[PDB]
Design a protein around this ligand. Structure first.
Ligand SMILES: C[As](C)(=O)[O-]
Ligand SMILES: C[As](C)(=O)[O-]
Ligand SMILES: C[As](C)(=O)[O-]
Ligand SMILES: C[As](C)(=O)[O-]
Ligand SMILES: C[As](C)(=O)[O-]
Ligand SMILES: C[As](C)(=O)[O-]
Ligand SMILES: [Zn+2]
Ligand SMILES: [Zn+2]
Ligand SMILES: [Zn+2]
Ligand SMILES: [Zn+2]
Ligand SMILES: [Zn+2]
Ligand SMILES: [Zn+2]
Lengths: 477, 475, 475
């Protein structure tokens, strides 16, 4: 009972040097929450279990947050979440300790009309890529279906939503052509005409009159509508709309001959999102908000893989909104947000690239990370990352204090860089922003890899950030 | 009787789609530049009892507890009209239609002067967006836009709009195919697609005309002409912002009159439909009794990416809502709560199925003429439309008796972007990309359905009436 | 006193002194850090009070207004003068420029193994550097060191500069070797700075030196060198952000001394000219009497797209005006009214006519040396300049006795973009892109007219004196 509670804290927050348990919780998390909707829902439920109070965006917060502050979260669009801890003794000059990550991952979306005519008896579905999917890595993979259904119960005018998930059933697969056929079997393949998921081969019930009353009748195969309705526990007639993903249902696993690796889908950026959220929860356990003088948050964004210019992406400003609304409700007096942000540190936590020993020519000597060491700073002099000399120094100081190791990633001068939310958050807030993350192999694959210790090592680092960033940043004044 | 007949034609109350189609054609023809379009809507708003508010003055003394019907203009090319009900509160949100009034055109260069070329007069021009291609060759081009002038013996700089219509002052002449390879396009936009304005025979500049700041920057024939159109002296002209545009008047067409052919549909088609819908809706709205905040905001510079003060990224919508709500309550307004409860229709024209290019249209995701409004859907952020917005629009249409169509690109194709994503992130409000579909977007002369203007007006009117009620189903 | 004012502020037609001060400024302040520090020291000497971003400005700015400046990141500076009689309807008179220039940055780990005895350092390009123009140039090293004195927990900053010593040179391969000596060259493997060729008798690292966080990240000779320049121990070094730059001092040139040759003109030329205009202007402003709000805001990261906290998109201008106006009045300020009445000059260098490349310059739309400020015009959103802005600057010039030139690209050419569109969009204010024209933009060593620095200062000084009065004629 009491020993199990101590052992639980030790596993989740790596207090007894137990990295294996947190690695498995991450794997289970990825497997049980295939879509962005599931991930945000998982964290929402996690936050409820650790006494964070949900606040709706749709209502003013002046009545919900008082002088004692506390632990809160809000959700936008079901895909964009911000959790935060506000201290009774917080002032504008203390700033905010932020970790910003994204919860969207490369996937395949069902088209608004997924219906395709049968092709020599084969059932197929019309889909679209979200980011750079539907390539050769997506061929011959077991694909489940899941996401958000919108429904309206009979004899009501309420539109409600349900999350669905076929796991472990792979409902479809994108079949490669056998190499025996020659040149037609050689990639790359047309994302509209060639990489189409095969969902069935049915044999010889037709649609009922009630099923035909569904808004989605004609838009999707009657078998599909029946299936998702059964998963949701509603009638076909009640289905209003849907937003469904196809995703790899292969469960993650520890691997390598010495178990040094973790293989799993959708690491970018659910890896950092998970580690940052668990760190927040671990940190929150020992925070009395009545005595604290800090403002801490993890904010999770959608649509980072498509450039962040949506209301649920980093450019939509959920962070800025949360800090403005909370501080207004907290003090009930004029808060200078420019002073707030000038004293803040934002960690833009996004996965970066582990050294791949089979492609040494793309990695910059002395500026790549390796597995199971620690967090990696993303450095770039051309604005792809927001990291600057003070932020580098802050993180290195933090790590030396907390016993963490820090690695570097920067591109070769003849190479090219990805871009993160970091520059966007820095510009929108005016606050010093540091791009960093847990490094991984095979980013944007359907199944990626990181170190087996790296989930725990990330949790450890981010926990130390929340504990010590304010004290460390004060050295620079 | 006359007022009942006008309401039927303009607001499609008696099922009359012909008249509103003709008014749209007349509107496009009579207002060739963005300046003219904004001026048209300003005059229209004045006639329906909307009060102009200047951006340069604080609105607290102009808007009170009763709210009302208002509009404002930035740069002469960015206009926001709004209806603020006396019983509005932050949790009601705002119902917004955002469209753009800029269209592909050709601009006179700051110095339009060119030396005569074997006797031919020509003017130096620049493309605004993807113009000066083969579709702009051999078209009758009028000249028009904004002149800035200063009356002689005064210091004030004033504005006049000018328009040569029906006179086409110039034409970009194709080379006869007889000459062979030189006559094959594409053509150089600087050296080959140059408007020919005249061929003058053997008065030189007077001493007064030389006092013009524009003397030497434009041909004296041109300066005299635009001076005459504005009713000012050449000496008084300080600057100008002039377009060249197709003066071919729009028309109903097709063997069964199913089509409307007209220039500059992108996006004056949705802008007109949304604005007429707002005026129709406003006729039956008592602002003393209303609990809603409704707006149509019209932007400039969308075709060049919206990053100007008069484009979507310049934030006129957000400013209007902030200034209105501060003046209205005279107390702190939670603008985050306002936008969280809002719906933005990003109304921009999308693509009708072209039966001659079936390979670029996505099966089950193309619109056809004369059916209804088309949702623009995109999973990679080119459009702001999401699952809830789709369901909302479909719910709204089922209630109002409208039809809804889909547009989405093929996976192996390419998509343009709209202001929708910009508005969504700037406000944090759910934004829905949709519009009236058309053929031949970005041509000098495009086409849509002859009923689509009226169908568009009907849908947007339905939006203003029922969006709040329908969106409450999702809460 | 009068001789100093006449030299700096060009009051007795002395253009050579200010040109030489500019050359000295460029030579003594090679990095963005030095440039901001130079302007900070200049502002201090002219009685502008420094305000930290990290504290509320309520206790530093009162109803009297005054002369102030603030700094973000050591590279983003905003200086401003706020009049006691200022109100929202007077707006703000803004010059916005950038102080970052194309350079070469040391990598976070600059260490390289010796290569047949040669010492080299690992570096990266900031903008389009490490090309053939960067070969065979004498390169100095300088920038910001972070250190922590022994027995303290205080991270402090020091600026270092090797000038006149060129520590580095990127050596071209001799043409004798043939094809390998033909560019372009790989920026990672071929354009690597050579820093030395050490001999055995450069001592081994001491135990204290090994305690540095930077031990292993840079070779010990480099660490010892930068420690000696800052006056600290190697062990105390925490981090560094260092540039490589041309140490060739600028000069007046041409057979008639019509030119000025110097490195890093983009955009320290306009920044210097704008800042000196502000100080010259500020000498005769009594803030107790003034009703104006004036600012020069200097940005970092313009050359890489401005999307950082210290770039234009980070909003230091907007922040300055909001914080100032809040502390100034303590009765709420309508910022939308403020910006609606404002003028922003986006002052960034544009392109002088290069007579060797006539084919890329647009006839009647290029500037020449020693005439005056050049308006940057573009109808596709690369610049923010509009017809009213053009007329304002021309009016202003006519009143102050300045000359104005034009720059616009040919229809078949390509344009760069400035911060102008960003600033116009973020504020909603009318923004005018203009600048002092130069040859050879983005070279390691560029050129402008020898009179153009003074002509720039004179024009910008005229702007601060007269912009409010002139813009009132357009109302
Ligand atoms: C050669 As193919 C278009 O079938 O990948
Ligand atoms: C766009 As990314 C840095 O999540 O691969
Ligand atoms: C070959 As050509 C420039 O006359 O279209
Ligand atoms: C830039 As567009 C969607 O108006 O063609
Ligand atoms: C031809 As080479 C890559 O040595 O510049
Ligand atoms: C990006 As630029 C207009 O300073 O060359
Ligand atoms: Zn990614
Ligand atoms: Zn990522
Ligand atoms: Zn368009
Ligand atoms: Zn459009
Ligand atoms: Zn530049
Ligand atoms: Zn520049």
């Amino acid at each position: 009972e009491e020993k199990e509670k101590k052992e639980n804290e030790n596993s989740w927050c790596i207090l007894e040097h137990n990295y294996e348990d947190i690695a498995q919780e991450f794997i289970d998390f990825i497997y049980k929450n295939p879509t962005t909707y599931h991930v945000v829902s998982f964290f929402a439920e996690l936050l409820d279990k650790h006494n964070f109070k949900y606040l709706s965006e749709k209502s003013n917060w002046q009545d919900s947050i008082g002088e004692d502050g506390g632990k809160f979260y809000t959700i936008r669009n079901g895909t964009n979440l911000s959790a935060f801890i506000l201290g009774k003794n917080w002032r504008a000059e203390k700033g905010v300790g932020v970790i910003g990550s994204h919860v969207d991952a490369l996937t395949v979306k069902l088209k608004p009309v997924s219906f395709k005519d049968t092709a020599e008896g084969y059932g197929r579905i019309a889909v679209a890529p979200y980011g750079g999917t539907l390539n050769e890595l997506w061929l011959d993979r077991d694909l489940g279906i899941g996401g958000r259904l919108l429904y309206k119960k009979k004899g009501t005018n309420e539109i409600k939503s349900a999350l669905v998930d076929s796991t472990p059933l792979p409902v479809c697969r994108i079949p490669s052509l056998a190499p025996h056929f020659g040149k037609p079997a050689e990639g790359p393949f047309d994302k509209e005409d060639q990489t189409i998921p095969v969902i069935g081969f049915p044999t010889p019930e037709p649609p009922t009159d009630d099923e035909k009353k569904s808004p989605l009748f004609g838009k999707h195969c009657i078998h599909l509508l029946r299936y998702v309705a059964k998963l949701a526990g509603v009638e076909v007639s009640e289905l209003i709309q849907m937003d469904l993903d196809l995703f790899d249902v292969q469960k993650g696993t520890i691997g390598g001959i010495g178990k040094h690796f973790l293989f799993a889908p959708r690491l970018d950026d659910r890896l950092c999102s998970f580690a940052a959220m668990i760190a927040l929860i671990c940190y929150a356990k020992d925070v009395n908000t009545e005595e604290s003088d800090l403002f801490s948050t993890v904010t999770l964004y959608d649509n980072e893989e498509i450039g962040s210019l949506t209301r649920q992406g980093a450019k939509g400003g959920l962070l800025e909104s949360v800090v403005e609304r909370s501080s207004s409700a907290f003090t009930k007096k004029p808060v200078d947000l420019h002073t707030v942000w000038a004293n803040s540190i934002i960690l833009s936590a996004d996965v970066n690239h582990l050294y791949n020993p089979n492609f040494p020519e793309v990695y910059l000597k002395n500026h790549f990370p390796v597995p199971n060491v620690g967090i990696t700073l993303s450095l770039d002099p051309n604005g792809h990352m927001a990291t600057d000399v003070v932020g580098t120094a802050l993180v290195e100081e933090l790590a030396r204090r907390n016993g963490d190791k820090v690695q570097y990633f920067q591109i070769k001068n003849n190479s090219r860089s990805g871009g993160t939310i970091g520059p966007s958050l820095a510009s929108q807030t005016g606050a010093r922003t540091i791009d960093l993350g847990i490094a991984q192999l095979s980013m944007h694959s359907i199944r990626a890899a990181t170190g087996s210790k790296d989930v725990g090592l990330g949790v450890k680092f981010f926990n130390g950030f929340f504990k010590h960033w304010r004290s460390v940043y004060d050295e620079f004044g």
